[PDB]
Structure formats: C-alpha cells, structure tokens
Design a protein around this ligand. Structure first.
Ligand SMILES: Cc1cn([C@H]2C[C@H](OP(=O)(O)O)[C@@H](COP(=O)(O)O)O2)c(=O)[nH]c1=O
Ligand SMILES: [Ca+2]
Length: 129
C-alpha cells in the first residue's frame, strides 16, 4: 500500500470527510471503522476528534487498500493519515469508532485496528464505558 496526497476541503462527520484528491473534490469514507452518527451517543465527540486531527494536520494523505476504491455511494474508501498518524486507528484507539465493515480484499490494516480497539475496550474509553 502507498500514501498519496490530498488536501482537506471540509470536515463532515466521524468517518467521512471531503478531500481534494488528484485535484477533484471527493467524499472519503474511512476503511474498517464505524463511528456513531452525529445524532447518536459519542457521534459529536467522534466528529470533533476527526475534525481537529484533520484541520490541524500539515499534511493529509490517503492510502487505498488492494480492493474496491469507491463504494456504492461514490465515496472513496481509504486509510487517511494526518501528519503520518492514521485517523482510522486513532478513532478506534480512543473508543470513538468500532472496527466494522471488514470486507475481504480491503482489510490490510484489520489486525492493527483490532489491537487498538482491544486497548480502548480494556481502558473503558468512550463507547466502551
Ligand atoms: C466502510 C464501507 C462502507 N460501505 C457501505 C456499506 C453500508 O451500506 P448501507 O448504506 O447499505 O448500510 C454503508 C455504511 O456506511 P456508513 O456507516 O457511512 O453509513 O456503506 C462499503 O460498501 N464499503 C466500505 O468499506
Ligand atoms: Ca457511521
């Protein structure tokens, strides 16, 4: 897998964001995670966390997996990094997302994220409290 550039256009919620990628605006959906919707418990805290991480970053990068790059809604499916730190992992590690939507052939970072979830759970953080 390789990291590619992108620039923040607009925060959306805990697991989607609008980025400019190869010079075109696209909504990206984070691979392998699920955050609570804004109206649900920890939804606003997830959105805030993601928003801050991405807006404060000097450099946003996208990393596609081996399989499908766009979902049925036209959303890019990627791992997103903010100054080299994986946003997908950070949300999970904070108890602000669950590992979810693990489809065969787009699951390179599954076990990394499952490890983060285990530690969040053990700490009783946020959704695991
Ligand atoms: C994260 C992800 C979601 N999706 C689809 C599955 C779900 O379909 P349905 O809309 O039919 O439930 C939906 C979940 O996204 P959200 O959690 O953004 O709603 O997006 C994928 O197809 N591939 C993926 O990797
Ligand atoms: Ca969601």
């Amino acid at each position: 897998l390789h990291k590619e550039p992108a620039t923040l256009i607009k925060a959306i919620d805990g697991d989607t964001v609008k980025l400019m990628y190869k010079g075109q605006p696209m909504t990206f959906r984070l691979l392998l995670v699920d955050t609570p919707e804004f109206n649900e418990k920890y939804g606003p805290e997830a959105s805030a966390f993601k928003k801050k991480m991405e807006e404060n970053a000097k450099k946003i990068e996208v990393e596609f997996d081996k399989g499908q790059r766009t979902d049925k809604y036209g959303r890019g499916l990627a791992y997103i990094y903010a100054d080299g730190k994986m946003v997908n992992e950070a949300l999970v590690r904070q108890g602000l997302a669950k590992v979810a939507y693990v489809y065969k052939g787009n699951n390179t970072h599954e076990q990394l994220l499952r490890k983060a979830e285990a530690q969040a759970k053990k700490e009783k953080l946020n959704i695991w409290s």
